[PDB]
Amino acid sequence: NLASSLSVDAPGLQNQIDELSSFSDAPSPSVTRVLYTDKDVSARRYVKNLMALAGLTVREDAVGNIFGKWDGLEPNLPAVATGSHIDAIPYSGKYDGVVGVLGAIEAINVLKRSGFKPKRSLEIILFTSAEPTRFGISCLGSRLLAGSKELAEALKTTVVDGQNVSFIEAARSAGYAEDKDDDLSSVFLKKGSYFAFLELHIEQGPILEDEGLDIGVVTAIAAPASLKVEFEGNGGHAGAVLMPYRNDAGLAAAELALAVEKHVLESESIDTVGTVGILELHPGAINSIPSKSHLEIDTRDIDEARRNTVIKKIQESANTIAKKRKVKLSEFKIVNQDPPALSDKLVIKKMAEAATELNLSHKMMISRAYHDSLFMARISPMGMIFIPCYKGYSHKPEEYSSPEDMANGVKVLSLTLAKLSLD
Amino acid sequence: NLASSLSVDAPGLQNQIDELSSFSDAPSPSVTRVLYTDKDVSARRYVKNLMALAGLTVREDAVGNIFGKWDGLEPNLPAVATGSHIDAIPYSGKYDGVVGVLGAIEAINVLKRSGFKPKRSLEIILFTSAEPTRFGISCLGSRLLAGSKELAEALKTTVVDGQNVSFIEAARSAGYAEDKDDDLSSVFLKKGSYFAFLELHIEQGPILEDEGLDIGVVTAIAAPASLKVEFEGNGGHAGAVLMPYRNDAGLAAAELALAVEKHVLESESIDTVGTVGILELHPGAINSIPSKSHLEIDTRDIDEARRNTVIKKIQESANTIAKKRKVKLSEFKIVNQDPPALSDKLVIKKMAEAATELNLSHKMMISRAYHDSLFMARISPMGMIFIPCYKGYSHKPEEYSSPEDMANGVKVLSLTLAKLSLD
Ligand SMILES: [Mn+2]
Ligand SMILES: [Mn+2]
Ligand SMILES: [Mn+2]
Ligand SMILES: [Mn+2]
Structure with a gap:
């Protein structure tokens, strides 16, 4: 079946994790990569290159959310979306966010290798930034996708960074937000524009590791x-x-x-x-x-x-x-x-089924960290897949998830996307 | 008599205070001016030019202590020295240190206008830096003049700033320390090389203002x-x-x-x-x-x-x-x-006499802040002249001493230098 046919290039995914970690203002093993800086631009180009190589239709919105779509047999239906962020707070790790971006692209390649034929389109989202490092605003990209007029107004009028660079100036230096008539409402997604949204992410806790489990099915976000x-x-x-x-x-x-x-x-x-x-x-x-x-x-x-x-x-x-x-x-x-937000009950159901079909152990759990999923949940049914990480370490260079942990998460992501696409 | 003949260009001295404050990495009314930076170099040139215009013979030592001498009638005798610093901690005022340098040059001009003829030479010292901002080391110049081999060694070997720039590298960029073979011991002064050392300084406390007094005769330094x-x-x-x-x-x-x-x-x-x-x-x-x-x-x-x-x-x-x-x-x-250091009893006596001959009220008092005088006291009999400052404010842009307060201090400096020159 589809499940048994899924095969991930685990060392290859690891190699891409390592390559992306080079775009950093901190020396290895730490990563610093802040929204709109030169390092962020380099990483954006690396991810967009991978999206194109995987045959995705690539586009960007006014603030630099990046979209990569695999057109389904019924392209007018609301697509199944998945993604995460690649920005990194000062002196952090290489896996936070990145696993859900590089791993989503890998999930697309996994499905293509298995000859999967999507009904609903699949679309990968690189959120423009999830960390609050630069402007004190977390999930800047997904908050705008979820329709925050309050945020759009502030970004246009008052928001600056710690060096008094305005959001508009920073965005423009990285090649974005060049329209004076745009109040950034162009970024807003209509409710129901996606059938569902999934985010694969390292646990950022020790529970899966401690309990000897492969996969966390996330039911809520703090x-x-x-x-x-x-x-x-x-x-x-x-x-x-x-x-x-x-x-x-x-x-x-x-x-x-x-x-x-x-x-x-x-x-x-x-x-x-x-x-x-x-x-x-x-x-x-x-x-x-x-x-x-x-x-x-x-x-x-x-x-x-x-x-x-x-x-x-x-x-x-x-x-x-x-x-x-x-x-x-x-x-x-x-x-x-x-x-807080609740994951959609039927998304949870498909994720747990997918893990079971892949012979992967799993449990229901909550996210303590926040994620772009928190705000995507306002637009569409949401779910998250957690994979284990060493001692739960995150936001520091000791952060670690194994090639196999990632590959397992990728397989669950591929199979859940496929189930949702065909639903 | 000499005392009644002394007259200061008070608004002229204020104009110089204002002009020097322009050499700053902080916007007016704040000053930031750190040792060996570009702003420090500009301020040094400004002061050396004033020294030249006052007819002084100017020399510099290995670390950038700057000396301006008015040759006495018996020039071989140990000179009477006076001076202070012009560096400024981040976002500070324009009178700290500066009054004792610009005011010392004005004291020379005042004595010359009066036809005073020094027996012992008078020498003005612009200490290379008093503030510990760049290297964590306070009074770097005067600590070396007073012969600290430990400091000389550290500056040659281990000392760097917060950007990992070495003392030597910083010093050379500003045009100093251009001798590979100098262990900086060349900076050291012999005990007794100066007959006395005086420093004019704003009080940095509210005492003279609150008590309604013109002059503080400093007895000790905390x-x-x-x-x-x-x-x-x-x-x-x-x-x-x-x-x-x-x-x-x-x-x-x-x-x-x-x-x-x-x-x-x-x-x-x-x-x-x-x-x-x-x-x-x-x-x-x-x-x-x-x-x-x-x-x-x-x-x-x-x-x-x-x-x-x-x-x-x-x-x-x-x-x-x-x-x-x-x-x-x-x-x-x-x-x-x-x-702590104690001011010399004979210096204190001459200073109090000077204030009295000038009809200026005074008290003996302790300095709570430290100064280059703290270390010059190890080489030479020392004393300090305090002038009032507004509400005692210092190390902030609200710091203020009036043109008259500064002129009074300059007159006491002039008259005390003259007394000590003609012992
Ligand atoms: Mn994070
Ligand atoms: Mn994250
Ligand atoms: Mn000071
Ligand atoms: Mn001072």
């Missing part, structure tokens, strides 16, 4: 939020300003970072997380008291209400700390605060 | 120290690594910063200060748990032993925090730990 906070004080000479007269913005930040941890632990649930990944002091000189501090705070929970309580407590603590330290809470911005 | 600390953890995915499994290096840093403040307050003396002016996270991404954190801590006291006690407690707290957070204390380095 609810993510991010906050941007700034404190302002008088600053001045570290040696000359006596302690009673200070309002140290650095210490306000230190206190807020510890309060974040505290409020997370207050939830009484293991599923709650919160992190201060960014804490910067200005002017940032050893002999100058910080007059401004800037924190970027990530917090999530599978339970939206519990997550929201943490955010509310964090805001209360920021105000309490500001008053006690006699600094100004000059910014408290909820950059995003998104609900 | 004992400064600085430390570098690093913590290391495992890092990973901020959304997926559950709280019990973390060893967050950023939270370890937050805890140490608060410990610094606590230990300072434990001294029970208002003369004790401590600051965390630098706190950096790696990788520094919102969705990446910090795996490395880096703190640079400044701590001082007029009492050396009381400060050292703070330093010991900070080291103890760093170890306790590391163990509790389950991170490695990967670095704890005392970058400098220097004793």
Whole structure:
């Protein structure tokens, strides 16, 4: 049958993972690849080349989401879509996102080798960026595909990066967004434009590895939020300003970072997380008291209400700390605060069937990380396929999934796509 | 008499202050001017030109200390020296250091206008740098003049900036250190090579302003120290690594910063200060748990032993925090730990006499900030003249000393130099 005929070039897929990892602003084994930079452009070209070699119709939208389509026997039907991202936060791994892009292309080649004849078209999506590194916005591409007018407006009017480069300027430097009449609404997909959307991704947790299982069938995605906070004080000479007269913005930040941890632990649930990944002091000189501090705070929970309580407590603590330290809470911005999503029940059903037909062990599980799937779920039925990764490591160079782990995920992806195409 | 004849071009001196501030990597009204950068080179040329116009014989040493001499009637005698620095930490003011260089040149012009004829030569020193911004080393020029073989060795062998540019490489780009065969010992001055050394400087405190006084006669300089600390953890995915499994290096840093403040307050003396002016996270991404954190801590006291006690407690707290957070204390380095200096009693007497002859109110007082005078005191009898500054602001763009305050300090400098020249 189709399932027994599926054959993946495992070392070849690994070789492509390794080649793509060379497009990096960090030295191997780390990867840094930020939206619209030269490294991102190089990686885009590499992926577009592979799409063309696999015989896909390749196109790009106004923000650089990249699409590769295999036309089905009934091309007017809503297509079955799959994809992920290739951007990489500073000093991260080679597998996050990339497995779902390179592995999707491989899934197409696997199906072509087996002589599969799609009814619904299959389309691979390289999302323009999923990481919030550059503009503080996560899933920038899929948020726009899912129709966020709020985001489109901000991208056109206010959004800049940490070097004060505007989104429009960055996009144009990489060959995109060159239309002054476009408010980016051109990117929006109609609900139902896809029959379904699947994303293959490394687990970013240790569960499949620990339990000796091949495949995770993802049933839900946890609810993510991010906050941007700034404190302002008088600053001045570290040696000359006596302690009673200070309002140290650095210490306000230190206190807020510890309060974040505290409020997370207050939830009484293991599923709650919160992190201060960014804490910067200005002017940032050893002999100058910080007059401004800037924190970027990530917090999530599978339970939206519990997550929201943490955010509310964090805001209360920021105000309490500001008053006690006699600094100004000059910014408290909820950059995003998104609900969790549920995978479509019939997509889950086909994925579990596919894994079973391939003699692969599997379990139902939730994603703790967020993914483009979170926002694609607003447009169409969604599912995710997890593969194991070593010790669950991710967002760091120790991140690892074996050639066989990837090949298994690719086979499940190929077979689920085929089932959905013929449905 | 000489005292009544002294007259300063106050708006002229202000114009020079403003012009020098233009040599900055930060936009007005802030100044940034770091050792050996292009802006530093431009500012050096500007000052050397003023020295030339004032009739001074100009020379430079191996590291770019700049000397301008007015030859006395007995030129073989040890000269009376005066000067300060012109480098500026990021986003600081335009009066710190600058007043003591531009004002020293103006003191020469003032004495010349009055027909004063020095017996001992007068020599103005532009110290190559006082701020520790580039290499973590404060008073680099005066530490070498005072004969630190340890510093000379490090500068030749290990010292680099945060961009891994070596001291030698940086120095050569600015036109200095062009001798392979110099161990920098050429910079060293013999004890007694100067009869006395004076530094005019803004108070960097609010005391003279609050008390309604013209001049501070500095009696001592507080004992400064600085430390570098690093913590290391495992890092990973901020959304997926559950709280019990973390060893967050950023939270370890937050805890140490608060410990610094606590230990300072434990001294029970208002003369004790401590600051965390630098706190950096790696990788520094919102969705990446910090795996490395880096703190640079400044701590001082007029009492050396009381400060050292703070330093010991900070080291103890760093170890306790590391163990509790389950991170490695990967670095704890005392970058400098220097004793206080006492101003020379005869210099103090002459300075107070000068202020009195000029009908300027004054008090004897301690300097809380450190200065090149701290190290020149090892070579020569030392004293400092403080002028008031607005609300004591320093190391920030709000720093301000009035044209009149500066002129008063220049007159006291002129008259004190004249007294010491004619001993
Ligand atoms: Mn990621
Ligand atoms: Mn990802
Ligand atoms: Mn200073
Ligand atoms: Mn200074």
